[PDB]
Write a protein that binds this ligand. Structure first.
Ligand SMILES: COC1=C(OC)C(=O)C(C/C=C(/C)CC/C=C(/C)CC/C=C(/C)CC/C=C(\C)CC/C=C(\C)CC/C=C(\C)CC/C=C(/C)CC/C=C(/C)CC/C=C(/C)CCC=C(C)C)=C(C)C1=O
Ligand SMILES: NC(=O)C1=CN([C@@H]2O[C@H](COP(=O)(O)OP(=O)(O)OC[C@H]3O[C@@H](n4cnc5c(N)ncnc54)[C@H](OP(=O)(O)O)[C@@H]3O)[C@@H](O)[C@H]2O)C=CC1
Ligand SMILES: [Zn+2]
Lengths: 342, 208, 125, 96, 86, 115, 460
């Protein structure tokens, strides 16, 4: 077990977990929680970054002295990947974008880069590989994002057969693009919903649940070559979910139905921004698509985690969206939304 | 015994001894012992019940006039049945003199607050309660003064560890400062310094 | 007027010590043995209370020695064994007491170095 | 007296080098390993043995009070030289 | 039912173990010759009380106090334990 | 006799009455604490926690120790009401960032040496 | 010997004597002082299991314990046996005995042979140094049989020399004529001398008869020989002749056994069978090696496909032949009970924690019992010591050396059988200084002891 990588201590900041993890995509939403959980117990964390170093500063306090190491990498350069995974026993891939840039399309970030990461990790002798996919990944999906996800998980399993593939469904959290995305739709007066959101079922999952699931899958020896689906405990209609979101934010909810073609036109219009788009056609397609039900796959409870319901954690995300008049309203004041749970 | 050795003052020693005898004669109900050190410092050891009557006397008597309370602190001696030694240091400007008043208490016995004698005592008593856990009866506003809000324990006790039990850090999952059990990258290195040869024969104790 | 309680002294709920560091600790009460490198006996006069030794490990950076138990450097001094036992009892710590070891008195005779018929005669000085 | 390991990592004068399978080597990626190149043992090995005509020599390390505490070294043994326990300088009585 | 070991815990000079001491002085030898392949471990107690332990198959074991017993009572107890009684 | 000086209570009944007063004060205060500090817990969670803290010391049988515990609880309540505590101090009662420590023998055996 | 372990920053630095007037005064032997560096080499740090090929490979505690538990559930009775080494503590001994009793196995054996004929281990004073180390000061005469006390028990030999110097003690030796650092009357090395003494046909018989405080010490090394029972019977007969002919002096103990193994007396108190004769009578399918590195039982002595489990702290003779390796704690890394030759129980303290994944030994056995379904009733060290008190109470009395004298019953029972002596001279295993330095797995791993052996073998 390589004596220097034998666990020591009480499992705290100054302890040694025995994990040496390279976390691709650590500067995003899920990455900060994963890095924080790794650094809590005394893991050595390697952060490959392509962004400005100022944009990694918030990850520095997450580990004890010497436990978080930052290195530049290029997604199109296999030598950078080899450099950042040379000394790791765990490689986590959290690289992803919800829009296409002029330099990276969905195939680049969801197929080519995961395949290169998996192949280089297999060459370098990395023992454990965690790859994140989507619950609704489908080769015949109307979303090219999900087609790329399905192709990429196929290639990751081809290049690293002992990989653990984790398929979450619409993670919600403080820095999420789900609860904040629906709460930022009020700036346009009404809320456009295809079919009034009455033909869409969502099963969102808490961010901390996903991060702890990744940690536990690392610590689980049986999780070696399995495929997990990380979903929340409740299923909601899109209409009811968005109405609940607006109730928690204490904003007036004015839903109106917009046809698929007009919503696609709006998404393409917003797609022309050189900055981070407010929405895209792919985002429009994914928002109005029902979450798949996959009972045959193991879930969070197979890793020892009871899924956190949305009703206990919606306020920690949506309190920021309230006016001054409603900031102090307590959590149990909103009367949770109806659930279609089989 | 010339330049290196600190000089003695017999005049002050005699004056302090006489005044200690005076105080002991006036208040036999509470005074248990009187001592004068060789560097001319007077100590009066009293029963706890006499904290207020003695201090008041030393403040108000025409021949004492100890109007200033310089300091008030506690000393922890775990081997004693009464753990905590309570020390009052008083200054008389009229007679240009200093005096020390000593008493004792344990963990569960209150000591009368002396804010009615010296207002300066207020914060001092708070500090004692904060650092040693000694409760002062009839204190106007007794609460922690030096430690963090919600802090548990009394750090200045001898059995309280130097680094305590909890440490603080910023956690990003909850977006706040959190307290967790203390873990040290380097443990404080205990040193055994005492020489096994006796230094001062004048303080040798009987061998029991 | 006094209130006349009749229970043994227990201050555990007031000391702010975590539960784990009360019921899982074992204190040793003993008179420390003389360091064999020196003949001075001045460090064998008082009683000591110390705690059980917990895990120390190597810091991944600098290779320093790291600990997680806050009581690894706690040593208390007592005049007698009874005072230490009382202090340990009122704090709820399980204790092990070792009796004081005194060297036994010995018969020294310089003249025995030069005995007429005994084996105590020395062959060199 | 620097020297390289099978991994290409320079070995320090303390003889400490990370193994081939040691993860901690990652700390030197995109950076360097600080190593002092003036090995004291080799440098003191180059000093010549001083011939003196007395059985006891005195050494304070040179510079008077800027050196080390003055010690006296016995030179009776002809099988070996007298070495200073502070400085490492060697002394001997003329032989042969 | 399968007897494996006998243990006799007696205190060296407490009065309550006198009978047990008498037994060990008088009847232990014949008991050991009658049962040569049966461990009969004689051990010394602090002043709590004398005891007899019988260990059976698969780790089950019973204890019986012998406080203030005479040599006859100890003999009877050992006779019942060694045979199909209780 | 035991010749012991009381703090506030002469026997266990008056100490229990003071405990009940402090418990009522905390129970009344909890909703205000939830509102003022902008906590994400429910009022039931806070009251359950208050009960838990009180239950932690249920075994105490010394009236002086009970009086001192009530004094400390009153100090904590005064700190909370005046917003001298911040949100971090209030949330420190819940230990939301400490990993669950196993209690059974086997898990402790696997993880390390601590008994 | 009472010692002080000096540690710094989680590492053992050195060993120093700790003053105890009745055991070692302020001295220790060189092996006690300098063998600690062996604690830093050849250490077992992780559980190991055999690969498909047959090589030892690291694994988790879970997997190794599961394999051991499956094998334990497979077999029962005589098919399961255990051997205890020389450095085992009483807590682990009693835990292992309880676990194997749960399977209905009584094949709990030590490597050191003691005669089971007669009283055997029933009577404690039958296998103890009943005079005690301090009693040597009082005794006028001492007879040593088949022993080289200088290397088997250096501090006991030092006490003998002290009373030789100050009390004019008379010392006689039966056995090989070794140098004891004091002059002694050598009666020879033939065992028959014992009988010649017992019949009264020897001058030393008269010397013993008129002694006021005679002392007979029989070495446990002498006991290793097959006739060992005959030697013990002859020594007991000599002691009985002294007891009857010279009257009764009060409470003075004549019969003594000098042990060389730190774990032997506790194991005998707990009911272990001395020697591995039971395992040779009925070979087991499952064999537990608890620090056993004497090479007494090899795989040639066992049926093929035998399952061997080694638990210990060093890779010696025992570790290589095992299917599963369970890394345990050394004596500096645990708080554990040892009983010396006198019968006095003492406890160590934790100086440094066990390296890597190694664990406390009784905890390893208790975890194994939990995984195997027959959970042992103790969870903490205090409860294991309470169990020790239930088995043998003297094990919790941590400085007591007092005990009952049961010599009459032991001698009467020893008179039952008449096993014959051999015509083999009593030759102790330790003949010179070079044989003294390496006698256990820690000292065999010590580089300082290797330097000492090299120095005494060739001077230069
Ligand atoms: C994922 O988070 C998100 C953000 O991050 C902070 C955003 O900014 C964001 C964009 C939303 C705001 C920045 C827009 C606020 C201003 C409105 C768009 C006003 C639009 C209409 C005005 C011209 C007012 C007058 C109305 C008509 C005359 C036109 C979105 C959608 C979002 O989703
Ligand atoms: N959020 C959700 O609801 C769901 C998320 N997932 C998956 O989880 C993973 C992370 O989720 P989230 O953290 O929310 O996504 P984020 O966009 O918040 O994090 C994106 C990370 O990917 C990196 N990245 C993106 N494109 C590139 C590129 N071309 N080259 C190098 N690095 C790149 C970013 O680096 P920089 O910061 O420099 O851009 C950032 O570190 C993604 O793979 C996502 O598909 C799965 C199911 C649902
Ligand atoms: Zn020099």
């Amino acid at each position: 077990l390589h004596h220097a990588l034998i666990p020591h201590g009480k499992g705290g900041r100054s302890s040694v977990s025995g994990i040496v993890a390279t976390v691709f995509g650590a500067t995003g939403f899920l990455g900060r929680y994963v890095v924080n959980h790794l650094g809590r117990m005394g893991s050595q964390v390697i952060v490959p970054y392509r962004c400005e170093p100022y944009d990694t500063m918030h990850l520095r306090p997450m580990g004890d002295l010497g436990q978080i190491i930052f290195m530049e990498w290029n997604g199109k350069d296999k030598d950078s990947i080899r450099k950042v995974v040379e000394h790791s026993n765990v490689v986590i891939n959290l690289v992803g974008r919800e829009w296409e840039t002029k330099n990276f399309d969905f195939e680049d970030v969801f197929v080519k880069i995961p395949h290169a990461i998996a192949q280089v990790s297999k060459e370098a002798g990395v023992e454990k590989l965690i790859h994140i996919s989507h619950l609704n990944a489908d080769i015949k999906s109307p979303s090219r994002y999900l087609r790329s996800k399905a192709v990429g998980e196929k290639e990751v399993r081809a290049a690293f057969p002992e990989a653990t593939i984790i398929k979450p469904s619409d993670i919600f959290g403080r820095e999420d693009r789900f609860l904040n995305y629906f709460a930022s739709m009020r700036w346009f007066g009404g809320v456009p919903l295809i079919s009034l959101g009455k033909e869409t079922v969502k099963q969102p999952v808490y961010i901390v649940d996903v991060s702890k699931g990744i940690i536990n899958a690392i610590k689980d020896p049986d999780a070696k070559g399995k495929t997990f689906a990380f979903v929340g405990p409740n299923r909601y209609l899109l209409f009811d979910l968005v109405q609940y979101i607006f109730a928690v934010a204490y904003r007036p909810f004015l839903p109106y139905p917009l046809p698929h073609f007009a919503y696609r036109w709006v998404g393409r219009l917003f797609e022309v921004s050189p900055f981070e788009p407010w929405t895209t056609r792919d985002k429009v397609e994914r928002v109005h698509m029902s979450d798949m039900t996959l009972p045959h796959l193991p879930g969070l409870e197979d890793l020892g985690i009871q899924a956190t319901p949305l009703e206990l954690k919606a306020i920690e995300v949506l309190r920021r969206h309230r006016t001054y008049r409603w900031l102090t309203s307590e959590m149990e004041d909103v009367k949770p939304a109806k659930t279609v749970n089989i | 015994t010339r330049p290196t050795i600190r000089p003695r003052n017999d005049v002050v020693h005699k004056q302090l001894s006489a005044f200690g005898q005076y105080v002991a004669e006036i208040l036999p109900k509470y005074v248990q012992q009187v001592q004068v050190s060789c560097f001319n410092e007077l100590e009066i050891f009293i029963h706890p019940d006499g904290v207020i009557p003695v201090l008041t006397f030393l403040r108000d008597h025409t021949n004492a006039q100890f109007k200033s309370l310089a300091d008030l602190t506690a000393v922890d001696v775990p081997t004693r049945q009464n753990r905590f030694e309570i020390v009052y240091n008083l200054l008389s400007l009229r007679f240009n003199s200093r005096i020390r008043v000593k008493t004792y208490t344990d963990e569960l016995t209150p000591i009368e607050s002396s804010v009615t004698v010296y207002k300066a005592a207020n914060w001092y008593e708070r500090e004692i309660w904060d650092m040693f856990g000694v409760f002062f009866a009839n204190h106007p506003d007794l609460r922690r003064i030096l430690t963090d809000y919600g802090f548990e324990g009394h750090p200045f006790r001898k059995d309280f560890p130097l680094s305590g039990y909890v440490e603080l850090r910023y956690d990003d999952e909850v977006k706040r400062v959190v307290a967790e059990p203390v873990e040290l990258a380097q443990e404080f290195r205990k040193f055994d310094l005492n020489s096994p040869w006796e230094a001062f024969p004048a303080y040798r104790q009987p061998p029991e | 007027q006094l209130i006349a309680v009749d229970e043994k002294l227990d201050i555990t709920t007031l000391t702010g010590v975590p539960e784990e560091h009360i019921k899982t600790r074992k204190v040793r009460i003993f008179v420390p043995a003389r360091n064999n490198m020196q003949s001075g006996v001045n460090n064998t006069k008082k009683w000591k209370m110390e705690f059980d030794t917990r895990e120390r490990w190597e810091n991944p950076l600098m290779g320093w020695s790291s600990t997680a138990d806050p009581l690894s450097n706690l040593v208390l001094t007592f005049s007698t064994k009874e005072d230490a036992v009382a202090f340990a009892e009122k704090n709820g710590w399980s204790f092990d007491v070792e009796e004081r070891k005194v060297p036994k008195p010995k018969s020294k005779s310089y003249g025995a170095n030069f005995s007429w018929n005994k084996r105590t005669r020395v062959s060199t000085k | 007296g620097v020297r390289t390991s099978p991994t290409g990592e320079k070995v320090t004068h303390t003889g400490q080098a990370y193994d081939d399978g040691d993860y901690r080597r990652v700390r030197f990626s995109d950076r360097q390993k600080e190593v002092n190149e003036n090995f004291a043992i080799d440098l003191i090995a180059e000093q010549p043995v001083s011939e003196v005509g007395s059985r006891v020599i005195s050494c304070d390390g040179g510079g008077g009070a800027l050196g080390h505490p003055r010690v006296y070294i016995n030179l009776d043994k002809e099988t070996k030289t007298g070495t200073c326990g502070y400085c490492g300088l060697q002394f001997r009585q003329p032989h042969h | 039912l399968g007897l494996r070991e006998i243990r006799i815990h007696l205190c060296q000079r407490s009065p309550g173990s006198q009978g047990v001491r008498d037994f060990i002085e008088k009847r232990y030898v014949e008991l050991k010759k009658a049962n040569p392949d049966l461990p009969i471990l004689i051990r010394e107690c602090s002043d709590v009380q004398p005891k007899l332990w019988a260990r059976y198959a698969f780790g089950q074991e019973k204890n019986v106090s012998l406080n203030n017993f005479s040599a006859d009572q100890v003999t009877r107890t050992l006779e019942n334990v060694l045979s199909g009684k209780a | 006799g035991t010749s012991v000086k009381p703090i506030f209570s002469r026997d266990m009944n008056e100490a229990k009455r003071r405990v009940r007063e402090l418990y009522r004060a905390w129970y009344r205060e909890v909703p205000n604490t939830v509102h003022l500090f902008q906590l994400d817990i429910s009022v039931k969670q806070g009251r359950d926690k208050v009960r838990e803290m009180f239950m932690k010391n249920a075994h105490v049988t010394d009236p002086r120790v009970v009086d001192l515990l009530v004094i400390k609880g009153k100090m904590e309540l005064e700190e909370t009401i005046n917003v001298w505590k911040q949100r971090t101090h209030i949330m420190r009662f819940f230990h939301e960032t400490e990993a669950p420590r196993p209690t059974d023998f086997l898990s402790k055996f696997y993880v390390g040496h601590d008994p | 010997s009472n010692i002080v372990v000096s540690t710094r920053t989680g590492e053992v630095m050195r060993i120093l004597p700790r003053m105890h007037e009745d055991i070692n005064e302020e001295w220790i032997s060189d092996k006690t002082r300098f063998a600690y560096d062996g604690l830093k080499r050849q250490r077992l740090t992780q559980p190991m299991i055999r690969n498909e090929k047959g090589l030892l490979t690291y694994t988790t505690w879970e997997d190794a314990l599961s394999r051991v538990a499956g094998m334990l559930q497979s077999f029962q009775g005589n098919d399961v046996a255990a051997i205890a080494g020389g450095l085992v503590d009483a807590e682990a001994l009693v835990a292992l005995k309880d676990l194997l009793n749960r399977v209905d196995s009584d094949s709990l054996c030590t490597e050191e042979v003691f005669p089971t004929a007669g009283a055997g281990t029933d009577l404690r004073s039958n296998y103890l140094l009943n005079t005690t180390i301090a009693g040597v000061e009082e005794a006028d005469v001492i007879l040593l049989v088949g022993t080289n006390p200088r290397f088997e028990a250096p501090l006991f030999n030092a006490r003998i020399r002290k009373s030789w110097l100050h009390n004019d003690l008379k010392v006689a030796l039966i056995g090989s004529p070794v140098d004891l650092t004091y002059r002694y009357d050598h009666l020879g090395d033939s065992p028959k001398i014992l009988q010649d003494i017992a019949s009264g046909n020897h001058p030393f018989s008269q010397i013993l008869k008129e002694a006021k405080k005679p002392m007979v010490v029989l070495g446990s090394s002498a006991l290793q020989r097959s006739d060992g029972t005959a030697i013990l019977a002859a020594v007991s007969n000599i002691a009985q002749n002294i007891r009857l002919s010279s009257g009764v002096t009060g409470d003075w103990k004549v019969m003594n056994i000098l042990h060389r193994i730190a774990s032997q007396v506790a194991a005998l108190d707990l009911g272990y069978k001395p020697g591995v004769e039971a395992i040779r009578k009925n070979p087991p399918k499952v064999l537990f090696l608890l620090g056993a590195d004497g090479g007494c039982i090899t795989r040639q002595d066992l049926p093929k496909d035998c399952f061997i489990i080694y638990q210990g702290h060093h890779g010696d003779v025992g570790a290589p032949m095992a299917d599963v390796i369970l890394p345990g704690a050394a004596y500096t890394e645990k708080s554990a009970t040892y009983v010396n030759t006198e019968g006095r129980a003492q406890q160590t303290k934790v100086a440094v924690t066990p390296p890597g994944l190694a664990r406390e030994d009784w905890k390893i056995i208790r975890a194994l019992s939990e995984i195997a379904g027959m959970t042992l009733p103790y969870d903490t060290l205090d409860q294991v010591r309470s169990r020790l008190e239930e088995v043998s109470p003297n094990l919790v009395r941590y400085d007591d050396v007092e005990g009952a004298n049961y010599f009459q019953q032991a001698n009467e029972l020893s008179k039952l059988v008449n096993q014959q002596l051999l015509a083999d001279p009593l030759v102790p295993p330790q003949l010179t200084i070079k044989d003294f330095y390496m006698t256990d797995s820690i000292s065999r791993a010590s580089q300082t002891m290797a330097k000492c052996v090299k120095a005494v073998t060739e001077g230069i």
